[PDB]
Each structure stands twice: as C-alpha cells, then as structure tokens.
Scaffold this active site. Structure first.
Site, PDB file in Angstrom:
ATOM      1  N   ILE A  14       0.786  -1.212  -0.028  1.00  0.00           N
ATOM      2  CA  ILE A  14      -0.068   0.114  -0.044  1.00  0.00           C
ATOM      3  C   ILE A  14       0.936   1.291  -0.130  1.00  0.00           C
ATOM      4  CG2 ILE A  14      -2.221  -0.562   0.598  1.00  0.00           C
ATOM      5  CD1 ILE A  14       0.082  -0.130   3.553  1.00  0.00           C
ATOM      6  N   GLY A  15       2.113   1.156   0.278  1.00  0.00           N
ATOM      7  CA  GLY A  15       3.200   2.337   0.153  1.00  0.00           C
ATOM      8  C   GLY A  15       4.429   1.428  -0.392  1.00  0.00           C
ATOM      9  N   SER A  16       5.266   2.380  -0.899  1.00  0.00           N
ATOM     10  CA  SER A  16       6.742   2.059  -1.116  1.00  0.00           C
ATOM     11  C   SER A  16       7.769   2.869  -0.578  1.00  0.00           C
ATOM     12  CB  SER A  16       6.879   1.980  -2.595  1.00  0.00           C
ATOM     13  OG  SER A  16       6.165   0.847  -3.095  1.00  0.00           O
ATOM     14  N   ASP A  17       8.902   0.631   2.375  1.00  0.00           N
ATOM     15  CA  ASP A  17       7.953  -0.192   1.732  1.00  0.00           C
ATOM     16  C   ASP A  17       6.856  -0.685   2.802  1.00  0.00           C
ATOM     17  OD1 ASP A  17       7.952  -0.655  -1.070  1.00  0.00           O
ATOM     18  OD2 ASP A  17       9.591  -2.091  -0.820  1.00  0.00           O
ATOM     19  N   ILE A  18       5.804  -0.191   2.455  1.00  0.00           N
ATOM     20  CA  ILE A  18       4.603  -0.217   3.396  1.00  0.00           C
ATOM     21  C   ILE A  18       3.312  -1.203   2.983  1.00  0.00           C
ATOM     22  CG2 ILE A  18       3.776   1.030   5.401  1.00  0.00           C
ATOM     23  CD1 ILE A  18       6.055   2.502   4.575  1.00  0.00           C
ATOM     24  N   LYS A  33       6.054  -2.592   7.453  1.00  0.00           N
ATOM     25  CA  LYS A  33       7.260  -1.913   6.709  1.00  0.00           C
ATOM     26  C   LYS A  33       8.649  -2.677   6.655  1.00  0.00           C
ATOM     27  CE  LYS A  33       8.729   1.887   7.694  1.00  0.00           C
ATOM     28  NZ  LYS A  33       9.284   3.174   7.960  1.00  0.00           N
ATOM     29  N   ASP A 123      11.663  15.488   9.457  1.00  0.00           N
ATOM     30  CA  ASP A 123      11.200  15.379   8.202  1.00  0.00           C
ATOM     31  C   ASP A 123       9.809  15.834   8.047  1.00  0.00           C
ATOM     32  OD1 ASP A 123      11.912  14.449   5.873  1.00  0.00           O
ATOM     33  OD2 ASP A 123      11.170  12.382   5.929  1.00  0.00           O
TER      34      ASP A 123
END
Ligand SMILES: O=C1CC[C@H](N2Cc3cc(Nc4noc5ccccc45)ccc3C2=O)C(=O)N1
Ligand SMILES: [Zn+2]
Lengths: 289, 778, 372
Positions: A14-18, A33, A123
């Site tokens: 679902i995300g990039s690395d999630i 992750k 961040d």
C-alpha cells in the site's frame, strides 16, 4: 507466501515499503514496513527504537512487532489512513482556510509531543502526516521517525551543541538554516511545518518548479530562492497570522523552545474570526458527501 | 480394616403381612415380614401363637401366599430386593420344623430402569402365573408349573410406561391397572397369553379415571371387577358396570392400605397416611370410619373382629373391631402392642443408672408415632410417646435432662395463623417459650424440648421462628465458661428459595426450670452440623466450615473459616482432625493448624454414591453408610512416600448391611478382648447393630469360618451368603471385603452338633468358646 | 431476533457440504486405548461438542486421512500448560464430517469432530514423525439412582408417580416424602435432584434464549449437563475441573454455582478490567450462547455472544468475510488497557436485521469474576 511474526500475511503493498497485512489469528489489518538486512540506508531498527519512546502520546501509532523474517527487518504497526499529500490530491490540490487551520492545530501538537520526549523530527512534510482509520479518522498521526534526532539530554535537558557543516531530506520543506548546513533543532521543525501550511495555502511554493540537473543543483536554487523571497511575499494575500508564525520560528534562537501555545493561538483566534466551528468537517469529508 | 458388624436389635418395622393356611391346611396363620425377617404365627382365639421365625439372606420385597391345584396347603412366594425369587413350603415332622425351598431363581434383567411406583408382585387367582413389574415398560411373567423349579421368566412389552398399580382380576388371566400420560390417568385391562407370550385385548374398555388413582383392588366372585381408589373418589369398574362414590370422610388424607374382610369381597378395610381406619362395604358402595390405629403399612383381618396393624412409622397393633353390636358405635380398641423402634433418626448412649452399663435413648418414629425409646440390656424398651416427630437428641448431665429437637405439623387458619392437629410434646410442656420474630396448608414447626432424664417429662419446650428449620443440636461447655449449654443450629426455609441463605446458631441454657436465650448469632446459610472442638464450636454453614470462640462477653467470635468444594452436611472430629462430608459420599479430612489459626486439608475421596452417615472409627479409619444399604470404611496413610498417596483415602471395607443407617454412635450396651472399639448404629427399620474392629489373625480365622458355615447352613430360598452380603448398587456389585458377618458367625451356636463337627474339620467345643466370647460384645 | 439461529451451527462459512458418516465408535468404559493427538489443537473439548477444524500442515492432513479409514477418533488434550506439554485429562473426538480440497496446489482438509468420551492420560509418546499418540484411560459416566428410592416405603411408593411454583412444591413433598425416615430434610434432597437441578438451570437458559425448554434441551441429565458445560464462558482451569466431574448431580450442581456466583467477565490479561456481565449473554445460535468456530487459517475460537461490551476499542473497519454469523460483519476488538485481543464486534448488513449490532467474545481472552 509471506507471513511475518507468525501472524501477519502480507496482502499487498500500500506504500513504497509499506504493506497491507492481515493477522491470521483475528483478521485485524496491520501495516508492515519491510527493510532489507544489509540495506543501503537502514532505519527500521532505529524507528522501532523511537516508537518505544514516543509510545503513549496522541497521534503516534502503536507498534505490534519488530523483528526479522527471511532477508528483511520487519516493522508491524497500526494501519493508518491516507497522508495529507494523498488528501491534497483528492481535493484537487487545494485546501480551504478552514482545513488548513484545523490541520494547523493537530500538526502543531504532534510536533510538540515529539519535542517533549527529546527528539526533533527533521522530516516535516505532508507525506508524513496521516489520518487514522475508523475511530481515528479525524485524528492526525505524525509518522516515519527514521530522521528523528535527539536534541537535549533527558535528565539534565542540556541541548545539543551548535554545529555548522551538515548535509540537509525533502528540500521543499527544509528550514533556511538547514540548507545553510546549520544543525537542526526544534525551531527548524516549526519553520518546516509553516512551509507545509503555505504549500496548502498556495497550490505551490516559490521554490517548487526550480529544475536543475543534479540534486546539489536542485537544492541550491530552492535554498537561495527561499532566501530571496520575503516571508511577507510568500504569505501575501493570506492572513497576517501565517507571516507571524514564520517570523516567529525564524526568530527563535538555536536552543530556544518554541511557544506552542502562542503558535496554536494565532490560528485558533484566526479560526474564531473567520466564524468557523471545529466540527471535523474537512474538505475531503465533503467530497465523500 | 477387617471389622466385625453384628446385630444388636433385629428390625422391628413391619413392611408386610399376610394371612393364610401355610403350616397346615387347618391352621390360620399370620405371616409378617420385617425386612430380612419372616415371622409365622397361628391365629388362635386368644391371640397369636409364634410358630417359626426364619432369617433370609435378602430384603423381602414381595410376600404372597397361593394354593395351586393339587397342594394340600398354601405356598409362600418371596422376591428379595436383589431379585432372588422363590417358593417355600412348611414341613414339620414331630418337633423338627423346616422351611423347604420348592423353587428358586434370580429374575433380574441385564437392562432396565427401576419403576417409579416400585416393584409389584401379583399372583393369578387360579395360580397360573406370577406377574412382576420390576422395570418400566415391561411386565415379567413367571409361569406356575411343577417343571419350573428354576423360576424362568419372559417379559411382555408394556406401552403404558407409567403404571401405578396392578392386580389380577377375579376366564383368561386378566390384569387391570392404572397408567399416567398427558391425556390423564386411565384404567385398562389385558389378557396374558402364556402360549402367545404377549398381551391380548382385555375384557373391558379403558375408562378414564381420577387423576389421583393410586390403588387397585380385585373383587372376587360373585361381584368380580375392580375397585379403583383415589384421593377424592372410590369407583367400582366391572366391565360395563359403574358405581362411583366421593365420600368427604376420606378427603382429609390419602388411603394407603386395604384388606378384604369377607372371602366374597363384601367388606374391605381401608387405612390412610394418618392412622384413620375405614370400612368399605354391586348396587351400592359406602365407607365407614372405624377408629384410629397406628399408621398402617399393612392391614390384615384375622378372625372374630381382631385385626393386625403393621406399622412402618410406628408401633404394631392387634386391635379389636366392634363393627357389630349395633347398640354401640363402630369403635377400635387396642388389644396388643408390639414394639417398633423404627425409624431411628437419632440416638445417644447415656450411663443413666448403673454408672457402668450404657443405655441407648433414641429418637424414633414419625408424626403421631413419634416417641423416645430407652433401650437397656433380651432388650428392654420404654416408650415415651411424643405425638410428633423427634429429629435430634442429646444428653446434658449437668442439668440431668435431655435436649431433643422435634417437629409438628399445623394447618393454616382462616383467621390467619396455624392450628395444630393434636396435642403433642411441644404443645403440652409444663413451661414454654417462643423465639422473638423479626388455606389449610401444612406448616412445619420446630422446637427444642427439654426432657427430665428420670421421669421423661417435657419440662420446657422452646418454639423457633416461623419458617425456621432446626438442623443441629449440641450440649457442651465453651471457652473459659463453667456453664454447659444447649446450642441449636438452624436454617430459614421459604418455598421460593432453593438454597438456605439465612440461619442461626442459638445458645440456650437450662437453669432452675427456666430456659433462656443466652446468645444468638445470625449466619448467611444453613447450619447443617455443629461439634464441640477443643473448647471451641465448629459450625458448618452451607459449604463453609467455621470455627467459633466463646468470648468472656458470652458471645461467639469467628476465629477462622474454610471454604470447601462441598456442602458440609456431616461433621465429626477426633483430636484436631475433622471429617467433612456431603450427601454424595464426598469425604474430606481437615486438620486445625493452631500455630497458624486455620485449617489444612489432609486427604479426600470423592466417589459419587448417596451417603447417609459417617463416623470416625480411629485416627486412620472412617465408617460410613452408602446407597443400597451398604457400609464402607475409608483409610488414611500419613506415612506414604508420595504426597499424592498421603492425601488419598483408600476404600478398605465394603459390606451389604441390608439396613438404612441414620446415625453412628460410639458406645456399648454391656458392662464396661478380641475386639477393639464399639460403634452402635440405628436404622430405618429400627434395627440396632454393632461395629467393632478385629486383628488380621481373628479376621482371617472368622473368614474361613464363614465359608465353611456357608457350605453347611441351609439358606431359606437357597440364597448364597456371598451374593447377599456383596456390595450393591444398580451399576456395580462387588464382593464384600473387610467385614465379618457376626450374625453368621454367631449362628454357629445354633447349628447341630454333627454340623458343628463338619465345620471344625481343619475341637468344635474350642470354637464355641470363641463364638460365645464374641456374643459378649452386645 | 431476526437472524436464523441455525445458520451459525451449519458452519456454512466453511464451504460446500462435507462428507458425513453415520456410524459411531465408543471404547468400552475403563478400557486402556492409545489414540493420536492433533498437534496444534489447544481446545479443552467438552463431550457433545462440535469442533470445526481446517488442517494445513502435511503431517496433520495425513493423520486425518488414516483416521477417516480407521475408528475416526483422535485425542484432544486438556493442558495444564501448553508449553509444558502436560495434560492429565482430555476427551475423545470422533470425526463425523470431512472434505478434502486442493487449494493453490496444496492439499487442505476441513473437518467437524464431536467430543465423545472423557479420559485420563496414562502416557504421552511423540513418535519419530513428530505426531504423538496418547495412552489413555476412558473415564466412565456416573449414573445414580434416586436419593430415597432405597428408603422408600413400598406402601408409600405411590408418592413417586407424580402429576409451576405450586407443582414443584407438590413434586418435592411427594417424591421426597420418604425424607421423613432419614435425618435430612426434604428440601436438602432437592439440592441433589437431577430434574430439580435441571429445572433450575432451564430457568437460567430461558433468560439467555427465548427457545422453548421442551424440545431443544435434552431430557437425560448426563447429556443435559454436558450441553450446559460447553456454553459456560469460564477459564480453562475451571473447565478442566468441570471435566473431572463424573456425576451429573455434581456436574449440574457446580454448573448452577458458577452461573450464580460469577456474574462479571473481565479481560484475562488485566484480570481487573471489566468487559461484560452475564446479564448481556444471549444465544444467537441453536447450540447456545457460546459455540466453537474456525478462522480461515485454522485458528479456532469459542465465541460467546453478548449484546453489549465495554472497555473495548475497535481496530479497522467492518469486514464481511468468514462471518461465522452470516449477514453480519466484524471489527477486531482489543482491551483498552493491555490491547490484547478480546473478540470481534458484529455489525449488521441489512437494516431489517435484529439485533443490528451484537458482540462475539473469544473465551480464551476472558476471566469469570465474583463481584465485591
Ligand atoms: O465471524 C468471524 C469473525 C472474524 C474471523 N476471521 C475472519 C478472518 C479472515 C482472515 N483473512 C485473511 N487473512 O489473510 C488474507 C489474505 C488475503 C485475503 C484475506 C485474508 C484472517 C483471519 C480471520 C478471522 O479470524 C472469522 O473467521 N469469523
Ligand atoms: Zn486487557
């Protein structure tokens, strides 16, 4: 077939690395992750360490499990909602003044909580602020603590020394001083958050479309383009309070604690002036109505 | 282990009686059954002539006379509780009398549920068959032939699964009975085909009868048919014919026995649960109240207006009826009274007179037959009538009196209140007192009686609270107090609640004819027991076992509690040891830890079987009574090498007693040896028995002597002595261990000299000395 | 109220109808037998209970195959400690439904077993293949005659045959009329009466289920006692104790005691955090308020249904897959203090359904509590 921790089957990325994962005991969905052992830029063990410190404050996600599985380091954690950058895109790159001011409040407090537990995020960007799921769908989570640094000792509260000559990250939202190689502190998180707000206010920033071949060249335009643009120019045509915030952050000394009550009051009073209610109706909540 | 149990007083309750011509075709006889005992009498003009008394290795569950074709005199059929069946005959030659066995066998099925209305044994009017209803849904038939010396039988399936009562009717062997179903209660008939081995359609249709029908009566010729008796009505069904009557005279209490006075069935004797005695007298049917006898288990008209009343709850009578002599009314007059100690629901041993020889004082009988009995060494009994039910008894030497809990029935009033049914010991005391409180339906009233040890008069009677139920009684001294007290532990009992949530422990004192409430402590449950524990009071409140201290403030102060897995019905104590029990054989051992002030479970043994009483034999042995009339001994081994063995109690004695014990009692009736210890017990039939311990040597010797005696002694009904004494439940039957039948050993003194020689064939006079020494224990 | 209580017991969620056997296997009472043990099963199986199963590892699939050919029975160990791998008692499970499926190339077998016979573990031996067989001793089932049948006056035997509050008063005075001869009262003999105990339990089951007592509920005390034992949300140390009981009179009696003393159900990890109370327990399945169910990956949860829970936080969002109670969805539920998993929340899918929300709690995460 990748089951992590004995219980978490990875459904998809679902995300990039999630990765979406499902607990095979109950069916609870969690985020995983994945970071390679012997990776170039290792942070997961670090993040797993910070999450133990930050555990307990609001908006900080719960850790289920850290450990190793096959070639990787694994972080299993709460599954959250979209990022603010996701929701910006959902709203066609435009937030109302209500959604900024509401988001300003939670965003200030998240950064404050981390500051209390003796770390700076370094961040601060819309990609790292996320709404929750379900019961937490109006709650804002500040995540991705790979770049988080201690700034003061826990018992004596002695600050970290002033340095220069460090490498800046996401140039777009960095502080003026952090480009100049000056070491970051709490002020630089605050100044960062403020650029994030203005980037909601105007669809872009004055340093956003500056192209140059190399990353050193990308940063150099942005850093001096920012230094060239006055805070009054940047916030022009927007409420005075946004300029007052940025003037405040850049007004801070290195070691000097931000007055979070004052920064939250500026927008809270302005929010009151604009005759808004804090009804957790954001722009995106309307598009889903 | 290796104990010796011996009868001290044979059973006295009468659970059945019949009349017929058994010793001779010319004599009239009265046969009485007292559990394991069969008594035979000749009916003379004067009274009853004792002729022969036999013992059986079984509990007589049926006893009926019948005279088949070709026989000069009646024969007697007997079925024991363990399902031994048999036919017996009376033979006398000069002076020698013998009860000879004409046929015998065991009729038990490997599969079957015992019926709700009990065993029923019936014999056809033409002596064609014996019908038994042992199990629900089956009718067992034993055919009456000369070639059936084994008593073989076949079952017929019975669709009517809830059968109440059944009799053979007076052309084909026909049975008439009563069944219960959702539709109601009905009366039906069946013919019984020996050849078809099944049922056929009966002579007359099923009629719907009263919903309280409990008794069937087969009218002989010329009337024929059957009489069905209920709570409100007495109907007469003979095929088509009907003659129903609903007299109010019988509505008060249920009728439980009947007897045909006239051989043609003209007049019948009826007796109810409350001692009333009626006469039932076909165009018309009518009832007549004759008078009052003991509560009858069984009636039997003898001749010339005399009747025998057998009493399970009370005393047995010969009464003279004056039905004729129409100048005076119908009136019952008591000619003879026969002692019945049963049921013995509690007792104690007191050294009243001789100050060496112990005397037994019991609570006995129930309802109007309630009494005390004082037994001393041929036994001698003195009956103190109470006209209500005694429940516990203890002695208090200091005040030279007995404390006895009791209970009487009173009926709810129209005015609001209750009225007793008759005078009774708690309502005729010389001094009375009631506890401070805070429609026609029976209500139970419980009292503490105070009774002079010499006169046995009711000096004081204390009545307890409304709906309070008295459970435990103690006499003892507590703490640093020189006074001796009566302590009663009670339970509050309301019909809506199912378990007792309130109770009391009440400390009375008897001084100068005045009974006073010294102290009262309210507890949150039933006080099932209490015992005096080394100067403290140990009281079981439901599943708690609590220990109380008697303060100098004359109050009970809780020292410790101990919550158990089980409800503490039974308590006992030797030393600092405690034995906790419950109705389901769940045994427990505790020990008080004085250095810690709390209790510490030592052992346990949970074997589910209904348990009627428990008693501490020694530090290591515990004696109990358990379902189907058995005795058992459990043992502790505090030496064992493993803690799993040392907290385990081993079953070391199993004996089929044949009696239902209600109380164990340490003591003796003889002047105060191969035996050690003495435990006296009393049972529901009024039996009193004696339990005492042996040595491995004396055990092994008597054990060999039993087997030999069994090879020589002729059992009436040819019932094996091992089978009879074998530990019995419906699920399991195990041979008896650890117990010497002293009733069998003592029978050696009665066997013939030639038979004595046969047993001693390894000196017979050497064995007579051993047996006579063993008769000196009771 | 508006959802079929029969749908959850069918275990339709497992898939298409399985192969059913009609035979039955029962070792004669007290007989020593060696029976194999399914390695991953942790349940303490009451007799008369359906245990769903989904087996994946090859050693497990082989083991069921042999059983479907032999007596079909495996041993389910009641563990004092799982990591100890120690068990003193357990129950035989007879397989009565199966189905084999080849999914994504891997053989998979789905089974419905039923608990048959209580046993005492004599010896446990793991063989060279990793599958362990159990020396076992079959523990008999205790049946007692009526309390006073022995002391019954044969003349008075008539009281026994008998014709709600007025009826039970006449039942106690007639069936226990012969308590007049014994030292204990009639009402104490009713504290040990199977039919009296069961009628007291039926009064508590009707509080949980509107179902008529007559049909659903077994007449036999042994079958009645084990059916009740299966649906009590108690902890494993209690259930191991309850299993040890051989007499229904005592089993029915320790069952009534548990239903009256323990009224609170708290998180086992906190021991002190209150989740729900017996007032909220209710039956949405035919087998009762609590049943045994299998998760897609084989985990089996004993799922007690309650209308209301509290101190639970929801995680995630409703999902409709594997809905043990079809027509409902689930949201994983954690304890608010320790975040342990407590169960799932079931939320309807069509507005006409009743109840519209209910909860399903997994026994292994609860702890029965006595208040004060
Ligand atoms: O009613 C109920 C309450 C909930 C309970 N469930 C449902 C469930 C689903 C599941 N699904 C998946 N795991 O990995 C997956 C990868 C891809 C696609 C689906 C999955 C894992 C565990 C469970 C579980 O425990 C149940 O079985 N019944
Ligand atoms: Zn918890």
């Amino acid at each position: 077939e990748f089951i992590v921790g004995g219980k978490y089957k990875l459904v998809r990325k679902i995300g990039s690395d999630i990765y979406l994962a499902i607990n095979i005991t109950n069916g609870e969905e969690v985020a995983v992750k994945l970071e390679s052992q012997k990776a170039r830029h290792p942070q997961l063990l670090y993040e797993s360490k910070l999450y133990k410190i930050l555990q307990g404050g609001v908006g900080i996600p719960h850790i289920r499990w850290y450990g190793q599985e096959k070639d990787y380091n694994v972080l299993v954690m709460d599954l959250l909602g979209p990022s603010l950058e996701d929701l910006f895109n959902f709203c066609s790159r435009r937030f109302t003044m209500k959604t900024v001011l509401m988001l300003a409040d939670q965003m200030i407090s998240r950064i404050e909580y981390v500051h209390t537990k003796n770390f700076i995020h370094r961040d601060i960007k819309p990609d790292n602020f996320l709404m929750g799921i379900g019961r937490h769908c109006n709650k804002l989570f500040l995540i991705d603590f790979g770049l988080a640094k201690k700034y003061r000792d826990n018992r004596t509260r002695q600050h970290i020394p002033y340095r220069e000559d460090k490498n800046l990250g996401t140039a777009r939202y960095a502080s003026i001083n952090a480009h100049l190689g000056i070491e970051q502190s709490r002020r630089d998180d605050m100044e960062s958050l403020g650029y994030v707000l203005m980037y909601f206010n105007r669809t872009s920033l004055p340093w956003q479309g500056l192209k140059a071949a190399t990353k050193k060249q990308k940063y150099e335009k942005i850093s001096e383009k920012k230094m060239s643009t006055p805070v009054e120019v940047l916030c022009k045509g927007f409420p005075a309070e946004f300029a007052m915030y940025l003037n405040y952050c850049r007004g801070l000394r290195f070691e000097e604690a931000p007055d979070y009550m004052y920064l939250r009051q500026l927008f809270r009073i302005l929010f009151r002036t604009l005759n808004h209610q804090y009804d957790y109706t954001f722009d995106w909540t309307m598009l889903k109505q | 282990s290796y104990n010796y149990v011996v009868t001290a007083q044979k059973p006295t309750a009468v659970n059945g009686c019949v009349t017929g011509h058994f010793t001779s075709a010319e004599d009239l006889n009265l046969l009485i059954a007292k559990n394991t005992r069969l008594e035979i009498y000749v009916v003379t003009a004067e009274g009853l002539r004792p002729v022969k008394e036999v013992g059986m290795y079984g509990k007589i569950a049926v006893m009926e006379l019948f005279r088949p074709k070709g026989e000069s005199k009646d024969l007697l059929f007997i079925l024991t509780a363990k399902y031994n069946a048999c036919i017996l005959e009376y033979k006398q030659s000069g002076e020698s009398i013998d009860i000879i066995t004409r046929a015998h066998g065991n009729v038990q099925d490997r599969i079957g549920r015992p019926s709700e209305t009990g065993i029923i044994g019936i014999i056809d009017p033409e002596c064609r068959m014996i019908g038994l209803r042992l199990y629900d849904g089956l009718f067992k038939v034993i055919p009456l032939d000369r070639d059936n010396k084994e008593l073989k039988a076949f079952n017929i399936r019975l669709e009517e699964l809830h059968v109440i009562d059944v009799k053979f009717l007076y052309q084909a062997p026909t049975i008439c009975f009563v069944y219960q179903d959702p539709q109601g209660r009905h009366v039906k008939t069946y013919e019984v085909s020996l050849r078809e081995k099944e049922f056929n359609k009966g002579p007359w249709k099923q009629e719907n009868v009263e919903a309280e029908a409990s008794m069937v009566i087969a009218v002989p010729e010329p009337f024929g048919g059957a009489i069905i008796i209920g709570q409100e009505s007495i109907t007469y069904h003979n095929g088509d014919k009907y003659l129903a009557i609903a007299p109010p005279i019988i509505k008060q209490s249920t009728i439980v026995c009947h007897n045909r006075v006239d051989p043609n069935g003209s007049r019948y004797l009826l007796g109810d649960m409350e001692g009333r005695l009626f006469m039932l007298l076909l165009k018309d049917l009518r009832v007549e109240l004759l008078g009052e006898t003991s509560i009858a288990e069984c009636l039997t008209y003898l001749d010339n207006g005399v009747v025998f009343v057998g009493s399970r709850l009370g005393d047995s009578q010969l009464v003279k009826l004056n039905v004729d002599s129409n100048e005076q009314g119908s009136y019952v007059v008591a000619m003879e009274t026969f002692t019945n100690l049963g049921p013995i629901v509690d007792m104690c041993v007191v050294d009243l007179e001789r100050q060496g020889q112990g005397q037994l004082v019991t609570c006995s009988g129930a309802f109007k037959e309630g009494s005390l009995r004082i037994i001393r060494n041929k036994l001698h009994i003195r009956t103190v009538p109470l006209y209500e039910s005694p429940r516990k008894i203890c002695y208090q030497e200091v005040s030279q009196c007995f404390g006895v809990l009791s209970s009487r029935i009173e009926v709810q009033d129209t005015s609001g209140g209750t009225t007793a049914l008759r005078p009774s010991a708690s309502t005729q005391a010389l001094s009375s007192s009631v506890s401070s409180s805070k429609f026609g339906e029976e209500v139970e009233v419980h009292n503490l009686l105070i009774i002079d040890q010499h006169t046995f008069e009711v000096l004081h009677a204390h009545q307890f609270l409304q709906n309070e139920y008295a459970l435990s009684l103690v006499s003892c001294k507590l703490g640093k107090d020189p006074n001796t007290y009566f302590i009663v532990g009670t339970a509050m009992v309301y019909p809506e609640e199912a378990e007792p949530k309130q109770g009391r422990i009440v400390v009375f004192q008897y001084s100068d004819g005045k009974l006073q409430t010294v102290a009262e402590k309210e507890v949150k449950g039933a006080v099932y027991s209490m015992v005096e524990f080394n100067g403290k009071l140990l009281a079981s409140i439901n599943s708690t076992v609590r220990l109380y201290e008697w303060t100098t403030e004359k109050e009970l102060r809780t020292e410790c509690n101990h919550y158990n897995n089980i409800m503490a019905l039974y308590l006992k104590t030797k030393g600092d040891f405690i034995l906790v029990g419950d109705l389901m054989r769940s045994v427990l051992l505790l020990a008080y830890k004085p250095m810690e002030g709390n209790f510490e479970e030592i052992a346990r043994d949970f074997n589910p079987n209904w348990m009627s009483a428990v008693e501490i034999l020694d530090d290591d042995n515990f004696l109990g009574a358990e379902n189907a009339f058995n005795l058992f001994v459990c043992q502790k081994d505090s030496a064992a090498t493993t803690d799993e063995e040392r907290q385990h109690l081993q079953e070391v004695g199993l004996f089929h007693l044949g009696e239902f014990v209600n109380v164990f009692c340490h003591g003796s009736l003889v002047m105060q040896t191969p035996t050690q210890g003495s435990v006296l017990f009393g049972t529901v039939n009024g039996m009193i028995g004696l339990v005492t311990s042996l040595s491995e040597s004396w055990y092994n010797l008597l054990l060999d002597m039993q087997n030999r005696l069994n090879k020589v002694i002729k059992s009436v009904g040819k019932i094996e002595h091992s089978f009879w004494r074998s530990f019995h439940t419906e699920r399991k039957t195990e041979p008896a261990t650890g117990f010497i039948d002293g009733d069998l050993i003592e029978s050696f003194l009665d066997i013939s000299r030639p038979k004595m020689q046969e047993v001693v064939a390894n000196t017979a006079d050497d064995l007579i000395k051993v047996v006579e020494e063993l008769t000196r224990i009771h | 109220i508006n959802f079929d209580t029969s749908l959850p017991t069918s275990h339709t969620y497992l898939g298409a109808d399985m192969e059913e056997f009609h035979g039955r296997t029962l070792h004669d009472d007290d007989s020593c037998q060696v029976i194999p043990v399914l390695p991953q099963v942790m349940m303490i199986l009451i007799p008369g209970q359906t245990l769903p199963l989904q087996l994946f590892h090859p050693q497990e699939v082989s083991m069921v195959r042999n059983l479907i050919q032999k007596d079909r029975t495996f041993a389910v160990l009641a563990y004092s400690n799982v990591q100890e791998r120690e068990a003193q008692f357990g129950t035989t499970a007879e397989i009565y439904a199966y189905r084999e499926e080849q999914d994504f190339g891997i053989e998979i077998v789905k089974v419905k077993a039923i608990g048959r016979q209580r046993f005492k573990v004599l010896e446990l031996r793991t063989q060279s293949d990793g599958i362990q067989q159990a020396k076992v001793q079959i523990l008999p089932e205790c049946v007692l005659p009526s309390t006073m049948s022995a002391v019954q006056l044969e003349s008075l035997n008539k009281c026994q045959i008998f014709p709600s509050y007025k009826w039970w008063q006449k039942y106690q005075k007639r069936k226990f009329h012969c308590a007049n001869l014994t030292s204990w009262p009639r009402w104490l003999y009713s504290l040990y009466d199977a039919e009296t105990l069961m009628d007291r339990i039926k009064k508590q089951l009707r509080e949980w289920d509107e179902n008529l007592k007559d049909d659903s509920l077994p007449s036999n005390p042994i079958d009645f006692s084990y059916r009740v034992a299966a649906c009590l949300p108690i902890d494993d140390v209690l259930r191991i104790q309850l299993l040890k009981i051989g007499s229904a009179i005592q089993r029915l009696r320790c069952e009534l005691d548990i239903m009256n003393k323990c009224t609170s159900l708290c998180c086992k990890q906190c021991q002190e955090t209150e989740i729900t109370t017996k007032n909220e327990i209710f039956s949405l399945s035919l087998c009762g308020p609590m049943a045994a169910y299998v998760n897609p990956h084989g985990y089996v949860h004993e799922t007690l249904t309650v209308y209301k829970a509290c101190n639970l936080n929801l995680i995630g969002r409703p999902s409709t897959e594997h809905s043990w109670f079809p027509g409902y969805a689930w949201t994983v539920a954690q304890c608010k203090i320790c975040a342990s998993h407590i169960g799932w929340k079931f939320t309807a899918t069509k507005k006409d359904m009743s109840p519209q929300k209910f909860w399903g709690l997994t026994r292994s995460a609860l702890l029965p509590t006595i208040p004060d």
